[PDB]
């Protein structure tokens, strides 16, 4: 509370805190468990690459990748990635990957990017503006040069099968005029089951505690639990009103897991003024008292904080569980409002009591069809009423505030 208010003194009241709790957490890793290695040692190493009018295209599927060994290979002059970073490819994973392969003149790398200019990109290798994947290229003057006039050039991903049929007479004696090989990897991040995944090992699966989970690349954090949601057989993820992952199917066991955020039980701290006492009580909003230590993950929480889970000074308001206040059966004027008819006060031997607020002294008017009460005397009261009438006239030199 002192941190939430940026203040060392705190007045009598109820304060909704910002969460500053340490919540240490641990990781969990889940993937499909297929064992084939992906054919990258073929794709980056073929005898001759295609002409760019009619590039090679290989589907990669049902296998374990090693984007780490590719990204660490000194072979590559460029490794530029779009919508993905080359590191994360080992932890993220994909429904399919498509490798497109061809030779270029070394000057032409400009044409191989999302929406780029030039006649190769215009005729015969258009990449979409939102391409997800990597463009990887290196010198091939040692192989694709001879000259080798076969190397021929002319909607996204269309092979282009007077003539447009231009070609390069590539020679070992050519330097921008040398042949270079390029591979483009295009990644299918769709909601179907993954089939190409990085070298990262799966862990055991943990439930009913806060964890940094990965499923197939979904690097979330939350309390995993089993769930009752009747998925249709083809559905692999389930989503919230927010369009955020609310549920998953595990890739190794076809059970459906809920996901839930950690410490969703919102905290309010009930305090007399710190000038009176350092004792406080905690309202966990919405939660049920028996769940409090599970909800706030008290198992990994500071001991002085942990005293606010259990301890018999525990009370279920309709607003949520109140802890560290003493419930009382008497009723009083509302000192600190808590909600749903409950108020707290600091009272005598002292404690924070909490009680159902008194609406007023109860009275029965002595009515009958023939009884009247007439006042025989009076008092002139002088009730005082206070009203705001103005506020501090400010004026901001907004040029000096912004740019002074």
């Amino acid at each position: 509370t002192k941190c939430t208010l940026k203040s060392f003194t705190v007045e009598k009241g109820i304060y909704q805190t910002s969460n500053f709790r340490v919540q240490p957490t641990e990781s969990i890793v889940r993937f499909p468990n297929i064992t084939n290695l992906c054919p990258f040692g073929e794709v980056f190493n073929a005898t001759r690459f295609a002409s760019v009018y009619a590039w090679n295209r290989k589907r990669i599927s049902n296998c374990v990748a090693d984007y780490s060994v590719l990204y660490n290979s000194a072979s590559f002059s460029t490794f530029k990635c779009y919508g993905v970073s080359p590191t994360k490819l080992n932890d993220l994973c994909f429904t399919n990957v498509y490798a497109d392969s061809f030779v270029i003149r070394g000057d032409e790398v400009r044409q191989i990017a999302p929406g780029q200019t030039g006649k190769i990109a215009d005729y015969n290798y258009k990449l979409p503006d939102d391409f997800t994947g990597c463009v990887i290229a290196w010198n091939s003057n040692n192989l694709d040069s001879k000259g080798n006039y076969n190397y021929l050039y002319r909607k996204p991903f269309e092979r282009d099968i007077y003539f447009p049929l231009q070609s390069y007479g590539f020679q070992p004696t050519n330097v921008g005029y040398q042949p270079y090989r390029v591979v483009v990897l295009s990644f299918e991040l769709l909601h179907a089951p993954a089939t190409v995944c990085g070298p990262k090992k799966s862990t055991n699966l943990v439930k009913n505690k806060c964890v940094n989970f990965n499923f197939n690349g979904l690097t979330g954090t939350g309390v995993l639990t089993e769930s009752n949601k009747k998925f249709l057989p083809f559905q692999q993820f389930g989503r919230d009103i927010a369009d955020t992952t609310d549920a998953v199917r595990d890739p190794q066991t076809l059970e459906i897991l809920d996901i839930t955020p950690c410490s969703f039980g919102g905290v309010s701290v009930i305090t007399p003024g710190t000038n009176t006492s350092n004792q406080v009580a905690v309202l966990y909003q919405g939660v049920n008292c028996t769940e409090v230590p599970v909800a706030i993950h008290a198992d990994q929480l500071t001991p002085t904080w942990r005293v606010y889970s259990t301890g018999s000074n525990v009370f279920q308001t309709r607003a949520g569980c109140l802890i560290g206040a003493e419930h009382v059966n008497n009723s009083y004027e509302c000192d600190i409002p808590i909600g749903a008819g409950i108020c707290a006060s600091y009272q005598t031997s002292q404690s924070i009591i909490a009680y159902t607020m008194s609406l007023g002294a109860e009275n029965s008017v002595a009515y009958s069809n023939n009884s009247i009460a007439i006042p025989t005397n009076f008092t002139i009261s002088v009730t005082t009423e206070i009203l705001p009438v103005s506020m501090t006239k400010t004026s901001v030199d907004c040029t000096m505030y912004i740019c002074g």
Binding site: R59, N96, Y98, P128, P156, F157, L190, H191, A192, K229, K230, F231, L232, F234, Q235, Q236, F237, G238, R239, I241, A247
Partner: protein, 211 residues
Amino acid sequence: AYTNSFTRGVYYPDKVFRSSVLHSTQDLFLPFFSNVTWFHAIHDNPVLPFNDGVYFASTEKSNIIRGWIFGTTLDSKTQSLLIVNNATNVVIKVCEFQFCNDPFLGVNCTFEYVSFKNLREFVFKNIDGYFKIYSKHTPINLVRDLPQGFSALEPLVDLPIGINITRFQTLLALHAAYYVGYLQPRTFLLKYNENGTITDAVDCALDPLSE
């Protein structure tokens, strides 16, 4: 001849579970109350346009309508898509297959696979080189025709096969009736129930009330 499609031809837009939500999405869908072209198994197996994507359905009792063929020219000049539904099995292939303009089933080939009382409904589409199939099988109450009502077609297939399909055909068993419609890009409102299932829909472009 034509018939009214009513609310037919919705399918799951993605492999995502949603509970109780009114989701809004845009995709190639059959327009509501569209004119679908109607055919009968008499002197059929013609070649129709594929346009931008197809809705197909057949009314059945014994599996007389057994398959489909798709491509540019359907005549071994290219890897034509071929599909058959044969009792205990389902078969899908692409190859330089060859046929006369009257194929029947007797009462660069990059893919090959093997697995009125009723209506069988389908959607066939291609986007970015990915071919897709969605489907549903049901009994029907109306004996004549496509019944006025609603049911979302569940996915069967995705294939990265990249064929420039512009024409297609259906296959008969010889020694039945079927429908052809075409998808349009439409915004749709889709009502999901508590069980991950689409159970009502709106074609937003249909009329000002739908908007």
